[PDB]
Ligand binder design. Structure first.
Ligand SMILES: Nc1ncnc2c1ncn2[C@@H]1O[C@H](COP(=O)(O)OP(=O)(O)OP(=O)(O)O)[C@@H](O)[C@H]1O
Ligand SMILES: [Mg+2]
Lengths: 121, 48, 49, 425
């Protein structure tokens, strides 16, 4: 938040006081930025699963919002994602492995996480 | 699964129940959240 | 909201608040009634039903 | 003497209302809606009591709920500075002024005194409460009694009294989890109860969201304030003393009359609002909101020194009440209501602002897609003009050249390229 900005200014002033310089200069700003970043620690538990889920949600909600017409199905979603990846996979083995992975991820999202809804024909 | 509101109205009026009761029941289910509208309000679907 | 600014005469036969207060106090202090047997039996029958 | 003439002359100006709206809180950037609401809260309305039976207040209470770092307390500080009679207190503890009346020997003067709470001391004034959620049981009970009955009862040490608490309440608070959840209602996000929330006429929600341009501007203002204070839309806001004099004169000598209200439109709109609230199936509207609208209308009529209420004030109060009601709903209900009621919410609005909102939504969607797929942002952001045109057509807007030439387009550092029919940021 803005409190971090004020803390950065205070740390810059502290660095200037330490080095007895008469003005705050970019070296002190860089040092305060470095220290404040190093103090922050990231939570460790996953990123790929979240990214895939977010992309799927974005696609489905764009489909819902853009059209009052009918929507797509699970197979259509899988085919669309594979078509988008087409330029990123070079061989059939990686393609089939990623297809299995995305199918399992979609099953987990629909059944376990309840994020996505499934309907019959 | 999805059901059209017209189908429910026809089914219950053939049973000769009033339409206002069906509307109120649908509104209460909407409040509870079991029933949701599709992109067009003609057809509803069931959640939990 | 419109009529609150001009006239406090919403209904023709309102009892004034001071008059209503004094009348309620008067009736409460003056007398106290009790039931009648003919009405009592009907009340009993209705309560049982 | 001449000050009255100056006040009348300023009233003669056709855009005095916007001047007053922009005159509030010079040191806070953004939150224009909050300042507009605080304008009505400061100017107030008019109590009505037909006979001695039906009392209706004219004080417009304000509640703010915000994520940390949104500067909720600065608004209260400014209001205390401006208001002639304003009391400030905090619910966390160790406040200079308490929130409950008690009888005690004063530590300094050593005399037996009856010290009433902050609510009693602010007769015909403003009471400000910070950290609204941290309050204990006694403070909540006293606040509920003072807001609903507008009087405080004391039975202590052989003293039985009732004291008047005709005051306007402005409060600030934080959500339960420390961050606002758009998927939950306002009541589920706040530690307070529904009866307490129902008392407030205006509810404001301040949600922190990463906007690079807005963050850049806020940081620029903060650093500029820090550098300046080292020891070594609105045309022009009014002076603070002039604003004080105008407020005093309007409160003393302006009493707008409702002799020109239009009941047909109000009744139809109320019926439609209730109908669609029941259609969505959550949080239906009630008659109380209409009352607030009327009060707000009166406040607006007090701003222009109008002695009679006209349709402009009614429509502005309608817009404010509708915004407050819609903002408390969850995602889907809020979106549906916003889409359906675009007719009323567009009163005196700016089309350029709506187009900027559309552009920002599209930019956010593109940035989110880029971050999710690539794993990192790209150096440029681009968007086709066709999508913007289609959405404007959906909102019934067919020309965008003025938007391209508008100052809002340049302020957000947008550019339009005809060589590719694209918008670049
Ligand atoms: N729009 C803004 N303009 C100027 N200063 C701002 C703005 N937003 C935040 N700040 C600054 O952020 C700092 C945060 O402190 P502040 O007391 O204002 O927070 P708060 O919103 O009351 O928070 P809390 O929820 O913790 O009570 C202040 O120094 C304030 O000046
Ligand atoms: Mg604070």
């Amino acid at each position: 938040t803005v409190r971090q900005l004020e803390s950065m200014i205070r740390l810059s002033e502290a660095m200037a006081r330490m080095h007895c310089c008469d003005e705050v200069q970019p070296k002190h700003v860089k040092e305060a930025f470095r220290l404040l970043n190093k103090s922050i620690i990231r939570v460790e538990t996953f990123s790929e699963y979240c990214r895939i889920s977010n992309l799927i949600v974005l696609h489905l909600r764009k489909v819902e919002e853009e059209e009052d017409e009918s929507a797509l199905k699970r197979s259509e979603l899988v085919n669309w994602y594979l078509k988008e990846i087409e330029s990123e996979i070079d061989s059939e083995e990686e393609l089939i492995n990623k297809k299995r992975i995305i199918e399992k991820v979609i099953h987990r999202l629909t059944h376990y996480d309840h994020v996505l809804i499934e309907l019959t024909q | 699964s999805q059901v059209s509101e017209h189908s429910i109205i026809k089914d219950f009026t053939k049973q000769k129940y009033p339409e206002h009761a069906i509307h109120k029941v649908l509104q209460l289910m909407l409040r509870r959240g079991e029933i949701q509208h599709r992109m067009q309000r003609k057809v509803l679907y069931r959640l939990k | 909201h419109v009529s609150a600014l001009t006239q406090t005469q919403a209904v023709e036969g309102e009892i004034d608040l001071a008059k209503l207060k004094k009348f309620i106090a008067y009736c409460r202090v003056k007398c106290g009634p009790r039931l009648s047997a003919e009405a009592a039996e009907k009340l009993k029958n209705r309560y049982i039903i | 003497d001449e000050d009255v003439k100056m006040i009348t002359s300023l009233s003669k100006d056709q855009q005095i209302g916007e001047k007053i709206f922009a005159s509030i809180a010079p040191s806070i950037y953004g939150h224009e809606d909050i300042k507009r609401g605080l304008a009505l809260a400061l100017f107030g309305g008019e109590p009505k009591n037909p006979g001695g039976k039906h009392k209706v207040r004219g004080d417009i209470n304000v509640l703010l709920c915000g994520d940390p770092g949104t500067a909720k307390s600065q608004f209260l500080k400014y209001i205390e500075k401006v208001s002639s009679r304003a009391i400030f207190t905090t619910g966390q503890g160790a406040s200079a002024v308490g929130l409950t009346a008690y009888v005690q020997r004063h530590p300094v003067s050593r005399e037996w005194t009856l010290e009433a709470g902050a609510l009693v001391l602010a007769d015909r004034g403003v009471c400000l409460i910070d950290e609204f959620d941290k309050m204990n049981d006694q403070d909540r009970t006293s606040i509920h009694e003072a807001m609903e009955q507008q009087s405080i009862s004391i039975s202590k040490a052989g003293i039985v009294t009732s004291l008047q608490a005709r005051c306007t309440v402005i409060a600030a608070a934080n959500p339960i989890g420390g961050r606002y959840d758009p998927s939950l209602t306002f009541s589920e996000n706040v530690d307070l109860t529904e009866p307490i929330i129902s008392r407030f006429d205006i509810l404001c929600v301040v949600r922190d969201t990463v906007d690079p341009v807005q963050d850049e501007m806020l940081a620029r203002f903060v650093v500029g304030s820090h550098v300046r204070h080292h020891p070594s839309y609105g045309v022009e806001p009014l002076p603070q003393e002039v604003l004080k004099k105008y407020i005093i004169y309007a409160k003393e000598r302006v009493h707008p009359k409702l002799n020109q209200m239009d009941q047909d439109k109000v009744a139809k709109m109320y019926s439609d609002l209730r109908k669609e609230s029941m259609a969505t199936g959550s949080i239906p509207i009630t008659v109380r909101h209409i009352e607030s609208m009327i009060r707000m209308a009166e406040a607006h009529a007090r701003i222009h020194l109008r002695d009679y209420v006209i349709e402009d004030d009614v429509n502005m109060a309608i817009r404010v009440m509708l915004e407050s009601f819609i903002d408390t709903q969850k995602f889907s209900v809020m979106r549906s209501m916003r889409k359906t009621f675009a007719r009323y919410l567009s009163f005196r609005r700016d089309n350029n602002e709506l187009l900027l909102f559309i552009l920002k939504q599209l930019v956010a969607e593109q940035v989110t897609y880029q971050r999710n797929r690539f794993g990192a942002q790209q150096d440029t952001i681009e968007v086709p003009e066709k999508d913007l045109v289609d959405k404007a057509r959906q909102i019934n807007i067919h020309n965008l050249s003025a938007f391209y030439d508008s100052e809002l387009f340049r302020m957000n550092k947008f550019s339009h390229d005809l060589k590719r029919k694209m918008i670049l940021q």
